Homo-oligomer: A and B are copies of this chain.
Amino acid sequence: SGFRKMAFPSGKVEGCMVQVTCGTTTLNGLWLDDVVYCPRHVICTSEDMLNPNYEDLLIRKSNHNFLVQAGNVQLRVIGHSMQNCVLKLKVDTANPKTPKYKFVRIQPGQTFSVLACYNGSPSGVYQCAMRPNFTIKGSFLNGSCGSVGFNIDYDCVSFCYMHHMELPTGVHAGTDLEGNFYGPFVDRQTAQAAGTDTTITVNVLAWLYAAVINGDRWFLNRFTTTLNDFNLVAMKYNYEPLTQDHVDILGPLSAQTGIAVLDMCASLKELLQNGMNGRTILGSALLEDEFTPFDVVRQCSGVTFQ
């Protein structure tokens, strides 16, 4: 028992991190097979980032201007190309530690683990969600660009995020591994405002199920509701609307606990309207929304990887 915000074991990803230097700019790259992926703004100076024309800047770079180091050993760059907002550097050596992998573009509300790196070296691992405004709330200091987010399914790593930017408000933006930004953001140092950061309702409900499974039961009430009635309350509190697809996804947690999804919605409605009155759920005084229904099933049943 117990319930923790848990990241995926990071070993398979640690073996893929390298340092990429272009001129005086160093950040992280991801080495899979004989390709290294990194943010294209490795080619920029601090001055360039105010208004970069990446195609024109890239004309001035050749393979030998990209310095790639894996541990203490230099890799030879034999080609380079730009795809959307990422650079692909072809090297002459396949990474011997390449895991089974795929590239996925996730949806808001999905969770993943981030391996924060500096100078190609892993610093730490944590779990976060893609927010509904397509930002993440991470922990990234200068030098962390090119750190990646991932999920693992048994032995296959699904890479879903590469870190590129901190907005002036201190939240984070980045791309999938095809180089397309999540959200409307661009890799330029300009004013970019994020939209409303709504709470991910289906994740809150999953976490309430986890709470019941682990013995935190005080918030269960005598009421039920309907989807439409619940969504009227959700909208008032800047919660995402719940759909029947979400209800279907929570089915296994409902069956395990015997608490109908709409009954749990009515418990959540009363927590929104009355508050927590100074009590906690699973050690939180807020309603937690960075566990998906699959995260809860996984942690509550003990799924493993290798």
Which residues of A are at the interface with B, using a C-beta cutoff of 8 A?
Answer: 1-12, 14-15, 71, 115-119, 121-126, 128, 137-144, 166, 170-172, 214-215, 275, 278, 280, 283-286, 299-306
Contacts and interface: CB of A to CB of B under 8 A. Distances in A.
Nearest to A123: B304
Contacts of A6: 116, 123-126, 139
B306 A126 contact: no
B283 A285 contact: no
7 contacts: A4-B139, A7-B125, A9-B115, A71-B306, A143-B302, A275-B278, A284-B285
B1 A140 contact: yes
Each complex incorporates copies of this chain amounting to 2
A122 B138 CA distance: 24
Q: Is the interface of A mostly helix, strand, loop or mixed?
A: loop
Contacts of A143: 302
Nearest to A137: B2
B141 A8 contact: no
B122 A2 contact: no
Given A118-B302, A121-B304, A304-B119, A7 B7 contact: yes
Contacts of A11: 9-12, 14-15, 122
Contacts of A125: 6-10, 125
A217 to B, nearest CB: 13
B137 A8 contact: no
